[PDB]
Paper text:
Biological nitrogen (N2) fixation is catalyzed by nitrogenases (N2ases). The most well‐studied N2ase (molybdenum [Mo] N2ase) consists of two component proteins: the Fe protein, a homodimer which contains a [4Fe4S] cluster, and the MoFe protein, a heterotetramer which contains two unique complex metalloclusters per heterodimer. Substrate reduction ultimately occurs at the multimetallic active site of the MoFe protein, called the FeMo‐cofactor, by a mechanism that remains enigmatic. The FeMo‐cofactor is comprised of iron and molybdenum atoms with an overall composition of [7Fe:9S:1C:1Mo]–R‐homocitrate.
Herein, we report a crystal structure with two CO ligands coordinated to the FeMo‐cofactor of the molybdenum nitrogenase at 1.33 Å resolution. In the Av1(CO)2 structure, one CO ligand is bridged between Fe2 and Fe6 in an analogous fashion to the previously reported Av1‐CO structure while a second CO ligand is terminally bound to Fe6. In this structure, Fe6 adopts a five‐coordinate trigonal bipyramidal geometry as opposed to the four‐coordinate tetrahedral geometry observed for the other Fe centers in this structure (including Fe2), as well as in the structures of the as‐isolated or Av1‐CO crystal structures. The terminal CO oxygen atom interacts with the side chain amide N of α‐Gln191 (ca. 3.2 Å), which may help stabilize substrate binding at Fe6. While the bridging CO ligand exhibits 100 % occupancy at both cofactors in the heterotetramer, the terminal CO moiety exhibits approximately 50 % occupancy, consistent with an expected weaker association of the second CO molecule under the experimental conditions. Av1(CO)2 was challenging to prepare due to the weaker binding of the second CO and required pressurization of Av1‐CO crystals to 80 psi to maximize occupancy of that site. It is important to note that Av1(CO)2 can only be observed when Av1‐CO is used as the starting material; that is, FeMo‐cofactor in the as‐isolated Av1 protein is incapable of binding CO on its own, consistent with previously reported studies. The Fe6‐interstital carbon distance increases by approximately 0.06 Å on the binding of the second CO ligand, which is likely an underestimate due to the fractional occupancy of the terminal CO ligand. Finally, and in line with our crystallographic data, the EPR spectrum of a crystal slurry consisting of Av1(CO)2 crystals confirms the presence of hi‐CO. The expansion of the Fe6 coordination environment to accommodate a second CO ligand represents a new mode of FeMo‐cofactor ligand binding that complements the displacement of belt sulfurs by ligands that has been previously reported for Mo and V N2ases.
Author numbering:
A (entry chain C), D (entry chain A): 4 to 480
B (entry chain D), C (entry chain B): 2 to 523
Write the structure that this text describes.
């Protein structure tokens, strides 16, 4: 329906809440107007969640350990505190890497200090120092240690910075203290920022006066691609076919050395703005490295991004750009010819974290689909500013959506597909709505780049058009 | 590149030469990687007895645990009550992880709320979060009961749940009569199974402590059944089926089998089935209470004995032939119902399968892990099968449990080569399966990484994983299985013997090399 | 040599160097073996399209059939009647084979006698063998019924069963009132399923043809169920359970589930359970008769329609979602019983599993074989799952059945790349899985040799077997499984998606090679 | 049990039968007297089975195709007639071989003419000739074809000898017609004899004029070992460690060439007397090759056999014999030290085919076990003559035992272990009596030789002492 019907759907849903929750939630729900460039006129974001309402959000530890640090493959990341957080986050996020796990790479392992009551009462800093020695004995090829604080650490007054300094000096080892306790902030978002500042403070400056590395004019870094199902590799291949040299990937398949080399690049290429804008602005301030936002979802966005990146270099790169575009043209055109007739006109509602709820819209539109509702767990108003121009007039926007709201919106809007996460998937399938995981790619992908678009289209088609959907109603009912 | 009529996902896309060459250039240019000969040397060292001795000297570092934290268990307990919302007072990150962890195992929705305490609550505590959280949860999700547990920041700050819930009622946020049982569930004490015990005893106290003076033991002619932390649907189902077939009146206290298995029929059901409030209020009127997993129900046991005055029987988990027999004989004694022809026949069908399969099972060597009651029942059944449970790991085990398992092992000739490990993790277990190689592992999905490691040393060293336990994330619908009773024993026997025969077929598949033993008939 | 602490059986004993050297010397000295390069060249040729074209031109040679002979099916049918001894008139070698073939699939005793006709009977026929054989069988084994079929020598000599049985009674070898139903079961007609149909129709005629005057259709308010040749215990059990849950009165006609699953309790039970004589005598009083496997019950259908005057419904085997739905809706119409809440919920739980597992099933390609009804139901369910059943082989299939399956394939986009083959064997199927390689085979244990052949070409060409069908000899207790109904579809779905995921784990287990895709969660 | 109690048990059991069956079965049941050398004074054998009594016996086609011809690995054996017989006998017998199945070896395949009604009515000879051409096209490395007749072939008057001669001449191929129709004889036994005469008539004489074989004084053939689970290989290894040269194995792992070379050997070593005495006598007659019976079950028999065989050769082989016996002494002594205390005094009843019912008694006695009853499906009185000195006084002997008899004898005698076949196994296990398959070795073995004894001992112990046997009685009964 129109702005009229969407505003009254909002008001009807909010009738269930007690007054305080109703007043708060009304500020987080909006009907898009793509002419607005100041979203702080139509939606509030990055505030506390209301108690008891079944937010989909995680915590700062998820944003630091889960998202930014955990993918760094040749470091050991300690989940520091009791056993839960490291165990639930073990190998849940598909931040792919090449390595020999347990020997030179450690990503899908769960290292923890497994706090017990005596650690809460008397502190964990002695245990942390002993744990570091045990790591160095049993994992000698590790290239650095991070300490990912869980809730108790700051609450009990432990000093992990002092342990990291003393042990780092004793062992000549990079040991990074990260104060990403889940009591901090309101969501995964502050964990990104905390994590960025810890890279800045303890890793990124190591090679500041070290000019051993041989730079070229075409050196770039991929900033904020966590290589979900290999997404960063299907992006890197195109940048290097265009003649660029990808010195670093932050942090999917990332090594500590490539992070330390990043201040030598000529251009930072930012995919995930939300999680990595902080360190990008730092690098421009300190090293003079420019940064730019790009989008590798679907052919329209990937072609625009390649051209915009190549324009920052010289005619030789712009020429290679057009050769890459010519090479992949028949491939993505075949994907559209097969799949767009199967998906044309279908309507999608999204709910994801900080980037994908706007970034995937172009790829849907390349298959003739319409994103009729979108929202984020933990985005800020600068994300909503970028969303309002990507979404159609009179579409539904939701910040930090409640379980109740999402279900009620879906029952009225009746999308043909939903793209969200694991806590949402099984709800919507029972309602007879095709569902694709848009965090984990439902164990598929990559989705980035030309090669990723083929898999994206295959996946949306296999699910939306599956024979299972015609079978939920028993014929006697 | 892609060919549109055979699209490649990550595997095998990245094996194309262009991707391989790109990854080689990334490594060589930018990763400052240890040379492959050094990686190989360190890998081989991690397989040795010397490495195992250093590994077993750890005091501070845990690697690849085989346990989770208390509130996960409190949530699963709470899910088993009719129209009940699990509610975890404290930090919301914890709830996103508990829900996801169970979502992935059951492939179902998992409903749980937080009251979203933040750093601000360190000054003043989480009282306001409890008030608004209870009111909001009740209004929005219309539960008939909210079962409250805690996250570790609430425990460290010291929030008094009892006082906070009482004040929520006193100040009008929820009606006085609305049930809000609670339990303190510190993640730094015990494990997820401790959380279950704490939540259950809190729910039992809420509905019975203050109303004992009208109770009469045996007056409702039923037996209470407490299942503990249980993640196989077939285990709730088999216990109810066996007691129904015996004509025994019972109440299963915490029963999530409906809410963890709703139909896909075009509607989402937040709640389904579950233990009624009346079942808990009436539970002291039972003949007795049977604990299916006694090694994590010790606080429950003290309350049931101390307050309900039930003479809880000393029964092991009903796994395998002897302990299922013991369970049924004790239920027969308590209820006055004979064991029926149907269960006698099912028992003898299990024994038939044991006779049929004993030659392939005999002497087979296993490493295994899990929660204490599950582990001891698996050990017992393996000894009944003539198998050797040589590495028995229970990360969340205790000394008294170990002594019990050691005594079971000492009583069987099949226990001679077995060791029980408590407080040790899957990085410890990895060393054991290299230094004292068994035939198979029986464990959860985190075992797949150990199998990977063993294969890397060589095919002859590979230890295949048999997935029994929790969580199982990398296979579909195994949560529908059964491990209890004669039905569970039949399922475990079938899985074990066919795992043995699948591996023997792999080892004998080589044309003109090993296929002299590739028999049609086994 | 052996080491007493670790004795080696044939595998891996014969891999010891002394054995390897000995076998090399045997080959080189005395076997005049084709050179390995010639063996490799011929092997490679047998994988080619050129070879497939010669293979498909065969008219006289059969290699690795996927069918057996009539009397095997007559035996299985007879075993489904109370205290009934299967008796095969003719040559005793046949009965040793029938018993052994079922022994190995069910891991159970299989009781059956011969009357041991020899060469001498070619002059005079087997009348005396029938007389002494019926007397001896009745006296020794004390059956309440003897159900008589034939071997091929009795068919070629032309022995008149009806005359011989009538003469046995006339001459006092067995009582006039003792039931001795019979059927001619020539092995050179049809297959084992034709023997089942022939036997059943003979038993039905015996108890009803001459007693029709007092029958009234519908008077007993029940529905007859005829299962056909069925070797999964869970398929007899699921039909009985679903009809009982629905409150439908029924008679299952030929029900061997008890005698193929006796308990091991210290006594041997030659007979157990089965359809009663009273049930067969009363069967014409039913509302109607449903055939679970109509494509091998054509003779029974003609008798039931022509003599009982039942309007047998046009129903497919109850496999998959649509055909289980159709079966229950037609049973509801006949009986007047609504479909209960329990079965509606079970249906929805199957649909849930379909929605949960569809991403890994989608587009997977299968080669499959078995008996016609089983095959067409497996094809139908695979299409429901979004799978492609690309090689459909039914050795004992007919042209009418093929047209029916072709129509099912034509109606689904998932049938576009599928071909149905009748009269073709497992040597034909081996060619198809080389020339047009599918992901998996679904078949009986004889498929393991095709998997072995495909691996020999290379790991990338290997087609793993998923064992569903008959016989299954190389795994234990799969005969307890279910393929019918929602329960069967849930078991099939679970077996298929976990076979996919186990192979993907194998292909992604390579350290630093393919283990970037060795995901914990799938 | 006394002689008088065994006689009473036989009469009690026979009371169930009609008079003709009782009078016949009485002749086939005896109480051993080890002094008798003429078993024709105490038991009848090799007669027709009584109709209706559930004989365990098979047919001549089992004896020819299943037993003698089927194992020959580089020939193609055609099951000629309708589809049953070849399907039930496909890969049921564990006659092990080294080869490339479907390419140079064919043992576990089922080749058939799949008779239909037209073939019965009009004959199968045209179909057989066409089948042979199809085999030659599709299996070009076959080194010969056999035609294994099933019941209908002689009954319909087909002429498979003519087809074999004409096609064999056309293709320069050995094509062997075998008239092993199941209506012939009374059991598997006549199938052995028919098969032996077919080897004599169509294969064995091929090299009669050929002088190119490099003979040695130590050349032997193993006659009548079908290599069940590798039994012939664990025999061959000892003969060759003793200095002999095993030219041929009849027929386990056998090749057509080694059969054709057998007339060139110095000595035929006969294990299975029943199945291969016929061709052994022929070879002595025509080629002057002596033959001798031996026994490789258990250490006592194996040592006695090695010494008796070595005594046929010179001092060099007698010296190597003693070196082989000294090599294996500690190995079998370790097996006896481990397993005999676990089995001493246990009582076994056996029921098998033509050899094993007497031949395995020594091996049981090497573990301290007592064989208290034995019998055969299809043995002749010369086998019973050999049995009566191997069995103890007053033990029970049964020829062509009925299912009823075997159950009732077991119920009274209460053996600790039964050794028999697949049709017997599941009966006795339900009764609570440990059972071992003594045809297929229960998918274990080898049992021949010193290496086989270790596996035999392991297997009898694992089954007799298994924990399952204490669990049949429910504790509430
Ligand atoms: S917000 Fe951890 S799961 Fe919790 S009760 Fe503590 S052990 Fe268990 Fe974030 S950092 Fe972690 S995940 Fe929560 S605790 Fe805080
Ligand atoms: S004694 Fe064959 S199983 Fe029979 S009914 Fe004919 S096809 Fe079937 Fe021996 S040769 Fe064979 S096995 Fe018998 S038939 Fe004769
Ligand atoms: Ca589900
Ligand atoms: Ca059995
Ligand atoms: Mg490829
Ligand atoms: Mg796959
Ligand atoms: S891992
Ligand atoms: S085969």
């Amino acid at each position: 329906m129109s702005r009229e019907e969407v505003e009254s759907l909002i008001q009807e849903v909010l009738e269930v809440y007690p007054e305080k929750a109703r007043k708060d939630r009304n500020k987080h729900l909006a009907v898009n107007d793509p002419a607005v460039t100041q979203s702080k006129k139509c939606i509030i974001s990055n505030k506390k969640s209301q108690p008891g309402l079944m937010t989909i959000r995680g915590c700062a530890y998820a944003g630091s350990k889960g998202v930014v640090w955990g993918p760094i493959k040749d470091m050991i990341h300690i989940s520091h505190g009791p056993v839960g957080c490291g165990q639930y986050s073990r190998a849940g996020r598909r931040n792919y890497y090449i390595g020999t796990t347990g020997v030179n790479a450690f990503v899908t392992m769960n290292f923890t200090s497994d706090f017990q009551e005596k650690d809460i009462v008397f502190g964990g800093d002695k245990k942390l120092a002993k744990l570091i020695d045990e790591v160095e004995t049993l994992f000698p090829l590790n290239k650095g240690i991070s300490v990912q604080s869980e809730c108790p650490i700051g609450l009990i007054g432990d000093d992990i910075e002092s342990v990291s300094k003393v042990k780092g000096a004793e062992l000549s080892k990079t040991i990074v203290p990260v104060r990403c306790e889940g009591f901090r902030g309101v969501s995964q978002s502050l964990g990104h920022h905390i994590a960025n500042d810890a890279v800045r403070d303890w890793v990124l400056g190591k090679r500041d006066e070290d000019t051993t590395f041989a730079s070229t004019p075409y050196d770039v870094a991929i900033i904020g691609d966590y290589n979900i199902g290999g997404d960063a590799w299907s992006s890197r291949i195109l940048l290097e076919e265009m003649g660029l040299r990808c010195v670093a990937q932050w942090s999917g398949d990332g090594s500590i050395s490539e992070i330390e080399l990043t201040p030598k690049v000529k251009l930072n290429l930012v995919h995930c703005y939300r999680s990595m804008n902080y360190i990008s602005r730092h690098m421009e301030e300190k090293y003079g490295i420019p940064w730019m936002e790009y989008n590798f979802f679907g052919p329209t966005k990937t072609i625009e991004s390649l051209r915009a990146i190549a324009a920052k270099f010289d005619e030789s790169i712009q020429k290679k750009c057009e050769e890459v575009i010519a090479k992949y043209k028949p491939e993505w055109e075949a994907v559209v010819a097969k799949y767009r007739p199967r998906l044309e006109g279908k309507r999608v509602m999204l709910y994801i974290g900080g980037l994908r709820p706007r970034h995937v819209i172009g790829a849907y539109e390349d298959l003739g689909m319409e994103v009729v509702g979108t929202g984020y767990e933990f985005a800020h108003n600068d994300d909503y500013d970028r969303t309002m121009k990507e979404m159609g007039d009179s579409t539904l926007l939701y910040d930090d959506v409640t379980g109740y709201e999402f279900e009620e919106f879906v029952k009225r809007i009746k999308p043909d597909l939903i793209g969200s996460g694991i806590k949402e998937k099984f709800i919507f399938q029972k309602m007879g709505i095709p569902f694709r995981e848009m965090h984990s790619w439902d164990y598929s992908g990559p989705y980035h780049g030309f090669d990723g678009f083929a898999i994206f289209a295959r996946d949306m088609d296999m699910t939306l058009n599956n024979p299972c959907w015609k079978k939920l109603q028993a014929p006697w009912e | 590149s892609q060919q549109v009529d055979k699209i490649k996902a990550s595997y095998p896309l990245f094996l194309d030469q262009d991707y391989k060459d790109m990854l080689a250039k990334k490594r060589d240019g930018f990763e400052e990687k240890y040379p492959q000969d050094k990686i190989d040397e360190v890998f081989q060292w991690t397989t040795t007895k010397e490495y195992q001795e250093l590994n077993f000297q750890r005091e501070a570092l845990t690697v690849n645990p085989a346990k989770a934290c208390q509130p996960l268990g409190a949530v699963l307990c709470a899910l088993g009550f009719e129209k009940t919302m699990p509610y975890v007072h404290g930090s919301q990150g914890c709830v996103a992880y508990f829900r996801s962890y169970f979502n992935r195992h059951f492939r179902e929705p998992v409903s749980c709320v937080s009251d979203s305490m933040t750093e601000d609550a360190a000054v003043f505590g989480g009282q306001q979060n409890m008030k608004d959280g209870l009111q909001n949860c009740k209004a929005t999700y219309k539960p008939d009961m909210i079962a409250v547990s805690t996250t570790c920041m609430a425990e460290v700050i010291g929030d008094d749940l009892n006082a906070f819930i009482n004040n929520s009622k006193k100040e009008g946020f929820i009606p006085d009569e609305f049930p809000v049982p609670f339990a303190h569930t510190p993640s730094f004490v015990g494990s997820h199974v401790t959380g279950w015990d704490n939540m259950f005893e809190g729910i039992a106290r809420y509905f019975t402590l203050k109303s004992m003076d009208d109770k009469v033991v045996g007056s409702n002619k039923k037996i209470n059944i407490v299942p503990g932390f249980e993640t196989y649907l077939g285990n709730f189902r088999v216990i109810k089926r066996m007691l129904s077939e015996m004509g025994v009146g019972y109440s299963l206290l915490s029963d999530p089998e409906e809410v963890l298995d709703t139909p896909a029929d075009g509607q989402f059901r937040m709640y389904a089935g579950g233990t009624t409030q009346e079942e808990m209020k009436d539970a002291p009127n039972a003949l007795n209470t049977v604990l299916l997993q006694p090694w994590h129900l010790e606080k429950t046991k003290k309350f049931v004995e101390g307050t309900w005055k039930h003479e809880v029987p000393k029964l092991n988990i009903p796994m395998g032939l002897d302990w299922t027999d013991e369970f049924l004989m004790k239920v027969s004694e308590i209820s006055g119902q004979p064991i029926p022809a149907s269960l006698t026949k099912e028992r003898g069908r299990l024994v038939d399968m044991m006779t049929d399969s004993h030659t392939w099972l005999h002497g087979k060597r296993f490493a295994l892990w899990g929660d204490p009651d599950f582990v001891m029942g698996l050990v017992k059944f393996l000894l009944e099968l003539g198998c050797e449970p040589v590495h028995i790991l229970c990360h969340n085990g205790n000394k008294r449990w170990k002594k019990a398992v050691d005594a079971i092992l000492a009583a069987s000739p099949y226990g001679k080569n077995a060791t029980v490990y408590i407080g040790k993790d899957l990085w410890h277990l990895r060393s054991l399966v290299f230094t004292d190689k068994p035939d198979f592992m029986i464990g959860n999905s985190y075992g797949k990484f150990i199998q990977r490691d063993t294969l890397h040393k060589g095919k002859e060293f590979e230890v295949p994983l048999i997935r029994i336990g929790f969580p199982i994330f990398d296979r579909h619908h195994l949560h529908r299985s059964t491990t209890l009773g004669y039905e569970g024993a039949m399922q475990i026997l079938t899985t074990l013997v066919n795992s043995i025969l699948e591996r023997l077929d792999e080892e004998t598949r080589g044309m003109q090399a090993t296929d002299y033993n590739h028999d049609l008939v086994r």
